[PDB]
Symmetry: C2
Subunit: 62 residues, 2 copies
Amino acid sequence: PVFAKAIQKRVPCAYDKTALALEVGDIVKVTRMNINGQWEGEVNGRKGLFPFTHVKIFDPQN
Amino acid sequence: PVFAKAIQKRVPCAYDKTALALEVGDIVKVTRMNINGQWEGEVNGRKGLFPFTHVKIFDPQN
C-alpha cells in the first residue's frame, strides 16, 4: 500500500457516441438490424444504435 | 425496415461498477498498481479501479 492525492476528477460513467438516445414514446424509423443485438434507427434528425428491447414495431397508420 | 415506438428510455451513458470515483483532493489508499494501466485503491470505504494519471503518489521528500 501507498497513498496518493486525486489530482483529476473521475466519473464512473462512459458516453457512447454511437448510441441513439430514447424517450418513451419517441417514434423510431429503424434502419438496420442485427448489429450485434442492436438496431440502428432514427428519430427526428438523430440516428444511432440501440437495444431492440427498448422498442416495439407498430403499423405506421395503426 | 420498420417503425417502432420507444417503450423504454435509454441513455447513452454506461456505468462501470468497477471504477473508483475520484474527486480532486480525495486521499487514495492505493493497494495495488499494475504496469497494466489501472491501479486499485480506495477512498474511505469504497474500493475500485482507476488510471494512475489521476493521482500523485505523495513523496516523503517534499
